[PDB]
């Protein structure tokens, strides 16, 4: 039985579906993140634009 | 009609079509996107 099952999960397919959910996951987060970026980026300006004012004391 | 669709959906060659698809996505974003990580640690400091 551990034989059967050891060429059941090294079957092609199955490696290929595997691939296929790993991309998925990766590339989903890769967009993510792209967004976050430029949400971050657009922060940060306002930040740094406000602080010259808001300077000190 | 469901289950003809869900086979549709399952089929090998359409997966490695839409995977493809998203490694190349990756590439045109993700391979300009992976750029700049220290500007915001160089910037919030």
Do not use: F, P, W
Not at 13 to 31: C, F
Not at 36 to 41: A, F, H, T, W
């Amino acid at each position: 039985l551990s034989t059967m099952e050891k060429r059941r999960r090294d079957s092609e397919e199955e490696v290929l579906r595997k691939t296929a959910h790993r991309v998925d996951l990766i590339a989903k987060y890769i967009g993510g993140l792209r967004e976050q970026e430029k949400r971050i980026k657009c922060l940060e300006s306002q930040a740094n634009y406000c602080m010259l004012l808001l300077s000190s004391m």
